[PDB]
Amino acid sequence: KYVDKIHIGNYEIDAWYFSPFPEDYGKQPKLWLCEYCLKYMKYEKSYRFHLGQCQWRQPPGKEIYRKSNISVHEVDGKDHKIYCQNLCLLAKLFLDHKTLYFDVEPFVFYILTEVDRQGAHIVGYFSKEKESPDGNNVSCIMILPPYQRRGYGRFLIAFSYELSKLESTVGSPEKPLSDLGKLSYRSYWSSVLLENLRDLSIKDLSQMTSITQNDIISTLQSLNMVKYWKGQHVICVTPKLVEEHLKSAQYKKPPITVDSVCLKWAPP
Ligand SMILES: Cc1cc(-c2ncccn2)cc(C(=O)NNS(=O)(=O)c2ccccc2)c1F
Ligand code: NA
Ligand SMILES: [Zn+2]
Secondary structure (H helix, E strand, O other): OOOOEEEEOOEEEEOOOOOOOOHHHHOOOOEEEOOOOOOEEOOHHHHHHHHHHOOOOOOOOEEEEEEOOEEEEEEEOOOOHHHHHHHHHHHHOOOOOOOOOOOOOOEEEEEEEEEOOOOEEEEEEEEEEOOOOOOEEEOOEEEOHHHOOOOHHHHHHHHHHHHHHHOOOOEEEOOOOOHHHHHHHHHHHHHHHHHHHHOOOHHHHHHHHOEOHHHHHHHHHHHOOEEEEOOEEEEOOOHHHHHHHHOOHHHOOOOOOOOHHHEOOOOO
């Protein structure tokens, strides 16, 4: 019997996938998680006692972004091992393809929180390899179900690329992407590219955005905005067709934007 249900903060969330919590934790009808330190517990009573005790009111690590009540914390896997393992076990409940939960030292974790008077409430996160051979600027990205499809995943995608800009490199999410992940990345790529084409080679779009040329090319193909000439992809779009795509229905929700001004981060 697996963990099939968690209580975190004020949310109950049904599990989507097996997550390797220890065998005695799985057997419980529900798992109780501290929304601040991510300690997981077997009983409501141990949960209630911890809430009276826990002094954390936000993630560990450094707050590398804060604009209004949106906050991102950078947490090194080697400096906060238990916390990051707890995060991974939490995320595996909603990630089918995630494989790594306890070997957290090679990763840095970017924790997205929504702040009120009580504290900084976890929304989701992405992990990133400290040294990515394959040039992946995201390893795993996960938004908790009650926050999904509300702008936070796009924010985190944009944030991963702002980091990639500050490192003077391009990056791509590690594959395979979840079903929701595929649509979010394609939607974000289109928006970023279409907005740059309204205001340029493919290599230029790559350097302005840190999106890989492959990701650019495939996004333009799905928009039917690239020509092929003797082995080379070439952008072929009119400023009118860009705008038709841009004012269409799906680009209408006002994003949470990443203000690079509010990003306090220097490249490793
Ligand atoms: C990358 C990603 C992953 C996951 C996820 N979560 C749990 C388990 C597995 N994957 C959820 C979201 C999400 O929430 N997407 N919706 S969106 O942020 O509003 C949005 C709108 C327009 C363009 C882009 C994004 C997401 F973006
Ligand atoms: Na649920
Ligand atoms: Zn706690």
